[PDB]
Amino acid sequence: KNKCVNFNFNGLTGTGVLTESNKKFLPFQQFGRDIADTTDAVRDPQTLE
Amino acid sequence: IANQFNSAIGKIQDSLSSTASALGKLQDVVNQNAQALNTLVKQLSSNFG
Ligand SMILES: *[C@@H]1O[C@H](CO)[C@@H](O[C@@H]2O[C@H](CO)[C@@H](O)[C@H](O)[C@H]2NC(C)=O)[C@H](O)[C@H]1NC(C)=O
User: Fold this and answer.
1) CB atoms within 10 A of CB A27
2) CB A37 to CB B41 under 8 A?
3) Which residues pair with A5 in a beta bridge?
4) Which of A38, B5, B47, B49 is the most buried (most CB within 10 A)?
5) Left, alpha or beta for A2 (phi > 0: left; psi -120 to 50: alpha)?
């Protein structure tokens, strides 16, 4: 967390700082998106947050 | 003549409190930039075939 990284979630590769989100995704949602259609936020596949 | 001028400046207080309608010319300019920035941002979602 809080460091810039080459992340990859389930094949969703990218560059970013990662942080804990107050955003509450539904169980059917694994990813979120920007108005620009970039992957904004992610639900982690091993720890459900 | 001073009472006319002082009255007339008094009416500018009321006009500029009550509405945006006169400043709409500056509103149009900031709004056009916001619209164009948001368009160039939304075009990132274009799949282009
Ligand atoms: C010119 O017009 C002004 C108003 O713009 C007149 O001034 C008013 O006069 C009456 C009394 O006659 C007062 O009750 C008002 O309060 C005055 N208004 C102001 C802003 O002072 C003025 O009398 C007119 N002069 C002439 C020569 O016709």
Assistant:
1) 7
2) no
3) A16
4) A38
5) left
Resolution (A): 3.7
End-to-end CA distance of chain B: 71
Beta strand pairing status for A31-33 and A4-9? unpaired
As a whole number of Å, the end-to-end CA separation of chain A is: 13
Query: Do A42 and A34 touch, CB atoms closer than 8 A?
Result: no
Please state whether beta strands A39-42 and A31-33 pair in parallel, antiparallel, or not at all (unpaired).
Answer: antiparallel
A34: left (phi over 0), alpha (psi -120 to 50) or beta: beta
Partners of residue B20 on adjacent β-strands: none
In chain B, residues with a C-beta closer than 8 Å to the C-beta of A36 are 41-42, 44-45
